Point group: D2
Chain length 257, copies 4
C-alpha cells in the first residue's frame, strides 16, 4: 500500500466520546482533517450544537447527539444513532470522555468510587462491546482509549482515578488479542498534564504547575493536539502492526527520576 494511502483516513468513520472540549475536541478535528467522518457527543446540547456548527464551516463532516456515557441506556441509544448514520460501518472508536476526582485515599467516598468506575471503565468497556459488530463490519477497526500516565506511577490524590485508568490499560491488551481475528486493533494513549478545560484549575495554580513542570523533562504541560496526533496515527493503516500498546504522551514525566 502506498504512502499516501497508509497515512490517510479518507473514507473512514469514527466515534469520539466527549468531543466538545480539550483533548476530545482536538481528536475530532484531527480525525476530520485526515478525511474521516466523525461522530461525537457530550452532555451539553448548546455547546455540542456550537461545535457542530463550527466544524461545518471548516468543511468537516461531523455529526453528534447529547449522551451521558455513564448511563447504560444512553450508551445504547448513542450506538444506535451511530449505526444508522454510518450504516452500521464504524472504523474508529475513541474512548476519550472521562471523569476525575482528586482526594486522598481516606477521603474517596462510595459515590466517588462508582462515579469514576462508571465513566472511566464501564463506559469504555460497554462502548467497545456495542461497537464490535460495526468495527468488524468496516473491515479495518481501530479502538483507542485515552488513559493517563498516572496509571503507572503514584500522584497525590489520584488513587481511584489512576486505578480506573490502570484497568483501561489492561483492557487494551485483552481487546487487542480477542478481536485480532476481526482485524480490529486496540491501543491506548496515556497523557500527562495537558492544557484542557478540565485541567484549567490546576493550570491556573502557579505553585502547582511549577511542581508539575519541574517533573517534566520538556519543562511544560502538553497541548491537546499533542495527544490527538498519536491517537489519529494509531488509527491509520500505517499503524497496522501496532496493537495492544500503551503509549505515554507525557514529555518524559513517568521515566524521569
Amino acid at each position: 500500500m502506498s504512502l499516501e494511502k497508509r497515512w490517510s483516513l479518507k473514507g473512514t468513520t469514527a466515534l469520539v466520546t466527549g468531543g466538545t472540549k480539550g483533548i476530545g475536541h482536538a481528536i475530532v478535528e484531527e480525525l476530520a482533517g485526515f478525511g474521516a467522518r466523525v461522530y461525537t457527543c457530550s452532555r451539553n446540547e448548546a455547546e455540542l450544537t456550537k461545535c457542530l456548527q463550527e466544524w461545518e464551516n471548516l468543511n468537516f463532516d461531523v455529526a453528534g447527539s447529547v449522551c451521558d456515557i455513564a448511563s447504560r441506556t444512553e450508551r445504547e441509544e448513542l450506538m444506535e444513532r451511530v449505526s444508522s448514520v454510518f450504516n452500521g460501518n464504524l472504523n474508529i472508536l475513541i474512548n476519550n470522555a472521562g471523569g476525575y476526582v482528586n482526594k486522598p485515599i481516606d477521603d474517596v467516598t462510595a459515590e466517588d468510587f462508582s462515579f469514576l468506575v462508571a465513566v472511566n471503565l464501564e463506559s469504555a468497556f460497554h462502548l467497545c462491546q456495542l461497537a464490535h459488530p460495526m468495527l468488524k463490519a468496516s473491515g479495518r477497526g481501530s479502538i483507542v482509549h485515552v488513559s493517563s500516565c498516572c496509571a503507572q506511577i503514584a500522584l497525590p490524590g489520584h488513587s481511584m482515578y489512576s486505578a480506573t485508568k490502570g484497568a483501561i490499560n489492561q483492557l487494551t491488551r485483552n481487546l487487542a488479542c480477542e478481536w485480532a481475528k476481526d482485524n480490529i486493533r486496540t491501543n491506548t494513549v496515556a497523557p500527562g498534564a495537558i492544557r484542557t478545560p478540565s485541567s484549567e484549575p490546576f493550570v491556573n495554580d502557579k505553585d502547582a504547575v511549577a511542581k508539575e513542570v519541574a517533573r517534566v523533562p520538556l519543562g511544560r504541560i502538553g497541548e491537546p493536539e499533542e495527544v490527538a496526533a498519536i491517537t489519529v496515527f494509531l488509527c491509520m493503516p500505517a499503524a497496522s502492526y501496532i496493537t495492544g500498546q500503551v503509549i505515554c504522551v507525557d514529555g518524559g514525566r513517568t521515566i524521569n527520576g
Copy 2:
C-alpha cells in the same frame, strides 16, 4: 535489628480475607507459623468453623467471622470485630478473597462487570480505608493485595477479571506513596495458575492445563504455599525497604516468549 527479629512476625496481628480455601488458607497458616495472630473470614460458617477448629489444634491463634466482602455493610462489621479483637492494632492486611468470570468480551454481562468490580476492586479499596487507622496505630503496617499475572498479559476470557486486577496493581502504588508517612508499606503478589479449589475445574481439564503448563518455564502449576511464602515475607521487617511493588509468582509465565 537482628536476623531473628527481621525474619519474624511474633507479636503481630493480621487480617486475611477468604482464608478457608486455597491461597488464603495457605496465607493464614504461613502467617500463624511465623508467630502472627490471624483473623480471617469467608461466606460459609460451617467451613470457617472447621478451619478455626483445625488451626486451634495446630496451636495457632486464629479468629474469624462470616463476612461477604462484596457488601459495604459487612466490610464495616468485619473491621469492627477485628478492631475489638486486636484492640485497634492491626499490622497486616491481606486482600486475598476475589472473584472470577471466564467469558469472551462480547459475553460479559452488566452483572458480571459489577460482581468483579465489587469483590476484586471496591472490597480491597474499602478494606484499606477501614484498616488505615489500625495499621497506623500498630506502628508497622503491611498491606498485601493478591492480584494476578494476567493483569500484565492477555488471556482468553480474562478481560474484566484481569482489568480489575490491573486496577489493584495501580492502587498498590498509590497506597505505598500516600501512607508511607504512617510507616505502612503496600505491595502486591500476582500469581499464575495455582492449585486451589477455584482453579480445580481448569486443573481437571487435561487439555487445558497442558496448554497452560506449556507456557510456564517451570512446566507445572503452582501450589498455594508458593504464593503464601512471598506474601508473608513482604510483611516481615526484612522487607522494610520494599513498597509499591508488583511481584509476579508465575514460574516465568509472563516473561516467556
Copy 3:
C-alpha cells in the same frame, strides 16, 4: 502549528544507519516521502550506490557513504561527512543497523558478546554523542533507536541480543531526560518478527514461521514499512510531547498470553 506543518518533515535532515536493506531501507524512503533530506550508509559499496541511484530516480535527496558502524574511526568519519553535507544541521538520527546471534546461553562466545555489544549498543551510544552538537544546532532534534520486542520477553537463543537491546531501551530514557534542554527527543521502536533480508532464514523455515505466527495475535509477521511509519511519526513535530518511550511494534506479540 497547523495540521499540515505538524505532520511534515519538509526542510529536515536525517541520518539512517543501514538503509540499504529491510527496515532501514523502508525508513529512508519513508523519511524522503515526507520531504526529508536523508543520509544513509552500509558496508557494501555496490549495494549503497544502487540504492542511491534508485532513490535519485524517485526524486529523493538521499546521500550515502560506506561505513561500518562497529568501528569507532568509521563512526567519526561518518559523522564528519554528515556535518559537511548538511552544514552541521541534523534534525533526525535513526539508529537502525544492528547485529544478531542466535545461540543458547551456554554457547555464546566472548566474540559473540563483544560483537553484539559493539554493533547494537556502543555504535548507537557513540553516534548519539557525535550527533548531539548537530541535533542541538537544528533547533528540533529527534533520536529514534530500533530495538526489539524481545527486550521485554525471553525468546530461545536471544539472550545476548536481547540484553543489548534492553540496554538500548534504558539509554532511551537517559537521552530523553538529559537532552530535553536541547529540544531533542529520544524514543525507541521495538519490532517483532519483520520480513527483512536478515530474517529470511527464519521466514523460509515453514515450521519456525508457524511457531512464531501462532504467538502473534495479528497472525502474521510484520513488514518493513510498518516499522518505518511509526519511526517517521516520532520525528514529526506532531510528536512534540512524546519522549523517552519504547513503542512495541509486534502485532501484539509481547502482550499475548
Copy 4:
C-alpha cells in the same frame, strides 16, 4: 515441604562476588545465618582475609580468594576454586560486585563504556555460564543478580551504568527460561540508594541526600541488609515458583510521581 524446610538454606552452597563491603557483605552474613556454606571474593587480599577471620569467629563457614571479576582468566580460576571447595555442587550464585560511573552522556569515554560493560554485564554473564554445570549438579539452583532501580528511570549521570543494569534485567528473563529445565531459577534485586562504602560520597553530600530522599516515599536511603534479605529469600525453596522477576528495592522510588 514443611515451613521450616521451605525457609532454610541449610545444606546449600553459595557464591557471592564482592562480599567484603556493603550489600555483598550483608548478603554473605545473611546467607550463612540461614545455614549456607558461602564463598566470596574481592580485589583486596588484606580486606578479604579480615572478613574471613570475622566470619569464622561468628561460626560461619565462609571461604574466599582474591579475584577481579572483570578478568576472564580470573573468573575461570575463581569458578575452578569454587568447584573443588564445594565438590562441583553449587546451589546459589549472587552477582553482586559491579562498577559505577557518574558522567553526562557527552562525557562518557570509550574506557568508561568498556569498564561498565565488563564489570556489570560480561562478568555476570560469563559467571552464569561457568556456574551452569554446578548449579545443575546441585539439583536446586538459584541465580540472583543485583541490578539497580535506575534501570527503569533516568537519573542524571547514570546513562551507561543504567544501560548495563538494564541489560542485566533482560538477561534475567533469558536465564529463567533457558535453564528452567535444569531446576535453576534466576531473579534480580534492583536496589535504590543504599548506604554502602561506594555510596559514601553521595551520603556525605547533605544536599544530594536531601534531593534523593525527597523522591523516596519511605523518606530515607536503604540499608545493606534490606537488599540482602529479599536476595536470600529468592534462594530459599519457599520461592520455588518465582523466576524471571526484577524486584525493585527502593522504598517506592521508581513509582513515586
